[PDB]
């Protein structure tokens, strides 16, 4: 049908606000402690402390199989980022420390998706 259609040029281009959305979250990491998986050879507890990672690399594949169906889904893979390396690590960490500035940085660009999504619709 044509309505699949117009939904899926629609989905298609809330990915396409989503990759850049994306891009400028991740610019926010210049360190790349985000960029991918913790690595479970190297943490092997991992999973006892952490029930759902999460992940820049990750988020992409999700992103790019068009697998995110609106803006709240993708902001709870990136509070997930935020909120699980806050958990693991402590306060006097660089990681945790990444974190929090990741969080205060994100927040003026996802303010702003937040706008250009109903906006846009
Ligand atoms: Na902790």
């Given at each position: 049908?044509?309505?699949?259609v117009?939904?899926?040029?629609?989905?298609?281009?809330?990915?396409?606000?989503?990759?850049?959305?994306?891009?400028?979250?991740?610019?926010?990491?210049?360190?790349?402690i985000?960029?991918?998986?913790?690595?479970?050879?190297?943490?092997?507890?991992?999973?006892?402390?952490?029930?759902?990672?999460?992940?820049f690399?990750?988020?992409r594949?999700?992103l790019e199989?068009?697998?995110?169906?609106?803006?709240h889904?993708?902001?709870?893979?990136?509070?997930?980022?935020i909120?699980?390396?806050?958990?693991?690590?402590?306060?006097?960490?660089?990681?945790?420390r990444?974190?929090?500035?990741?969080?205060?940085?994100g927040?003026?660009?996802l303010?702003?998706?937040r706008?250009?999504?109903?906006?846009?619709?």
């Amino acid at each position: 049908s044509m309505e699949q259609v117009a939904m899926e040029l629609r989905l298609t281009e809330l990915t396409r606000l989503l990759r850049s959305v994306l891009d400028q979250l991740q610019d926010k990491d210049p360190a790349r402690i985000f960029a991918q998986p913790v690595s479970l050879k190297e943490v092997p507890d991992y999973l006892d402390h952490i029930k759902h990672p999460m992940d820049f690399a990750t988020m992409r594949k999700r992103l790019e199989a068009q697998g995110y169906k609106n803006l709240h889904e993708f902001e709870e893979d990136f509070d997930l980022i935020i909120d699980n390396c806050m958990k693991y690590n402590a306060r006097d960490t660089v990681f945790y420390r990444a974190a929090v500035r990741l969080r205060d940085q994100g927040g003026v660009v996802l303010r702003q998706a937040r706008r250009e999504v109903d906006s846009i619709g």
